């Protein structure tokens, strides 16, 4: 395993959560970390993603204006802050790295469930 990530729980619509992915051996200018989500009965896509070299991002048009994604070199960990969350974000969340556009390693997945 290289990634594990962590923050997950229960959420009352409107609020906020914060995820953790801490990423461990193996790191560089040339890799891209990114957070994915599945909903039941749904297929996974990708939320956001970031280059660890330059902080260039990524977010996809569902979340974008209301989800931030940001990277601590010194603690080799990326950050989700999700907020103004609505029921219809209730998935597994999953962080990922990968380098030229591919995603090779894979976290655990965190269950972020959003109740009225």
């Known amino acids: 395993v290289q990634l594990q990530e962590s923050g997950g729980g229960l959420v009352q619509a409107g609020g906020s959560l914060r995820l953790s992915c801490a990423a461990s051996?193996?790191?560089?200018?040339?890799?891209?970390m990114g957070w994915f989500r599945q909903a039941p009965g749904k297929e996974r896509e990708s939320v956001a993603a970031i280059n660890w070299d330059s902080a260039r991002t990524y977010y996809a048009s569902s979340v974008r204006g209301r989800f931030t994604i940001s990277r601590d070199n010194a603690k080799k960990t990326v950050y989700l802050q999700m907020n103004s969350l609505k029921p219809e974000d209730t998935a597994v969340y999953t962080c990922?790295?990968?380098?030229?556009?591919?995603?090779?390693?894979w976290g655990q997945g965190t269950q972020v469930t959003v109740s009225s």
């Open positions: 051996g193996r790191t560089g200018s040339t890799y891209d």
């Open positions: 990922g790295a990968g380098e030229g556009g591919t995603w090779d390693s």
